[PDB]
Design an enzyme around this catalytic site. Structure first.
Site, short mmCIF file in Angstrom:
data_model
loop_
_atom_site.label_atom_id
_atom_site.label_comp_id
_atom_site.label_asym_id
_atom_site.label_seq_id
_atom_site.Cartn_x
_atom_site.Cartn_y
_atom_site.Cartn_z
N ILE A 16 0.91 -1.42 0.20
CA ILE A 16 0.14 0.22 -0.08
C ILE A 16 0.63 1.61 0.20
CG2 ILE A 16 -2.04 -1.30 1.71
CD1 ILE A 16 -0.80 -0.30 3.27
N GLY A 19 6.78 5.05 1.54
CA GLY A 19 7.73 6.92 1.13
C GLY A 19 8.96 7.23 1.69
N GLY A 20 8.96 6.10 3.56
CA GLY A 20 9.93 7.15 4.48
C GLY A 20 11.15 6.88 4.51
N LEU A 23 9.82 0.46 3.18
CA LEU A 23 7.99 -0.05 2.17
C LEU A 23 6.88 -0.39 3.17
CD1 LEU A 23 10.03 0.02 0.17
CD2 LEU A 23 10.03 -2.91 0.16
N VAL A 24 5.19 0.03 2.96
CA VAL A 24 4.56 -0.26 4.08
C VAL A 24 3.36 -1.26 2.99
CG1 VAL A 24 2.58 0.94 5.27
CG2 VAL A 24 4.57 1.76 4.30
N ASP A 131 4.25 17.55 12.74
CA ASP A 131 3.75 18.09 11.51
C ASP A 131 2.34 17.02 10.51
OD1 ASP A 131 4.09 17.77 8.59
OD2 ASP A 131 4.99 15.97 8.46
C1 LIG Z 1 0.09 3.81 8.91
C2 LIG Z 1 -1.27 3.41 8.08
C3 LIG Z 1 -2.12 2.73 8.40
N1 LIG Z 1 -3.72 2.68 7.91
C4 LIG Z 1 -3.87 2.58 6.80
C5 LIG Z 1 -2.43 3.73 6.11
C6 LIG Z 1 -2.91 3.54 4.68
C7 LIG Z 1 -2.25 4.22 3.59
C8 LIG Z 1 -0.95 4.35 4.64
C9 LIG Z 1 -0.19 3.88 5.80
S1 LIG Z 1 1.28 4.79 6.46
O1 LIG Z 1 2.08 3.95 6.52
O2 LIG Z 1 1.47 5.05 7.54
N2 LIG Z 1 1.65 6.26 5.43
C10 LIG Z 1 1.74 7.18 6.14
C11 LIG Z 1 2.84 7.29 5.48
C12 LIG Z 1 3.69 7.51 4.41
N3 LIG Z 1 2.62 7.52 3.16
C13 LIG Z 1 2.61 5.74 3.35
C14 LIG Z 1 1.06 6.33 3.88
C15 LIG Z 1 1.37 7.72 3.84
C16 LIG Z 1 -1.68 3.88 6.63
#
Ligand SMILES: Cc1cncc2cccc(S(=O)(=O)N3CCCNC[C@@H]3C)c12
Ligand SMILES: Cc1cncc2cccc(S(=O)(=O)N3CCCNC[C@@H]3C)c12
Length: 269
Positions: A16, A19-20, A23-24, A131
């Site tokens: 999903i 970004g930082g 990988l998520v 932030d």
């Molecule tokens: C924690 C989280 C928790 N639930 C749903 C999410 C859906 C997308 C991205 C995240 S997430 O990874 O927290 N996140 C924050 C960091 C920036 N890039 C990835 C996205 C914005 C979720």
């Protein structure tokens, strides 16, 4: 503590995002089948390790319904395991102009975020996010009767103990004036309070703070700091909401109110 789960307990499903520091992933928790989000860690800039650690520390000490919960840690690689919030983020939702959020739902959102911040400011010492903007608010549900509608997320930039100096360049439209151009006591919790007023503005109008204006970057910063430049509150805003926003965005941090006053005024709207 902060518990450790490594690999047996968890099952991956998709990806999903990026970004930082890694990988998520979306995944789920095999023991009770809760759905979760999994954040992985991937020289001199190789000290974003320090970032990962800092996020952990701050989270391990927060337990509130309007703040995203950290379940556990995983090893090899280093991973954070957090609750997954189903309905996206606030910034993307506001972009759908054809389908405006209804007024009662908007009120829930405003209150839910204010409760989360109040809890942060009541800690010893106070927790400062640093932030706060619309992409960092996640939506649990848009039903006006849900137990929870919004959650504060992404403590990527935050600290303890009310001090820190000017640091790293930022999207200045969300930040307090004492934090942008350099200052000293800058970055108390009062800076978060200024950011909250912008979140209130965006929810109210559906628009980006400062989008009515166009200036070069040096000029814009000077207008906000020295000239008191702020976004225009519309004529039909209820007066009680107009007052809360104006106090929250005061140039002098000392005039920004306690969250106990803020929660009370919002509940009367
Ligand atoms: C924690 C989280 C928790 N639930 C749903 C999410 C859906 C997308 C991205 C995240 S997430 O990874 O927290 N996140 C924050 C960091 C920036 N890039 C990835 C996205 C914005 C979720
Ligand atoms: C930062 C931190 C801060 N507070 C509690 C913690 C508990 C466990 C691990 C960490 S941690 O260091 O962040 N961490 C990443 C790898 C370092 N050692 C073990 C664990 C995997 C904590």
């Amino acid at each position: 503590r902060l518990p450790t789960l490594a690999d047996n307990e968890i099952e991956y499903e998709k990806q999903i995002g990026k970004g930082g520091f890694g990988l998520v992933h979306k995944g789920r928790l095999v023991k009770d089948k809760s759905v979760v989000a999994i954040k992985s860690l991937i020289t001199e800039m190789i000290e974003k390790f320090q970032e990962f650690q800092r996020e952990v520390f701050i989270m391990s000490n927060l337990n509130h319904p309007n703040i995203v919960k950290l379940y556990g840690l995983m090893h090899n690689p280093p991973r954070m395991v957090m609750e997954f919030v189903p309905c996206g983020d606030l910034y993307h939702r506001l972009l759908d102009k054809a389908h405006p959020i209804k007024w009662s739902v908007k009120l829930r959102l405003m209150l839910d975020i204010a409760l989360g911040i109040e809890y942060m400011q009541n800690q010893n010492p106070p927790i400062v996010h640093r932030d706060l903007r619309s992409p960092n608010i996640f939506l649990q549900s848009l039903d006006e009767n849900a137990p929870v509608c919004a959650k504060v997320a992404d403590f990527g930039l935050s600290q303890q103990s009310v001090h820190s100096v000017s640091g790293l360049l930022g999207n200045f439209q969300w930040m307090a004036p004492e934090t942008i151009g350099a200052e000293e006591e800058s970055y108390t919790e009062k800076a978060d309070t200024y950011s909250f007023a912008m979140i209130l503005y965006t929810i109210l109008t559906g628009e980006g703070p400062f989008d009515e204006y166009s200036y070069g970057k040096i000029k814009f910063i000077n207008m906000i700091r020295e000239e008191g430049l702020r976004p225009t509150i519309p004529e039909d805003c209820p007066p009680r909401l107009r007052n809360v926003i104006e106090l929250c965005w005061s140039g002098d941090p000392k005039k920004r109110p306690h969250f106990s006053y803020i929660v009370k005024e919002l509940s009367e709207l």
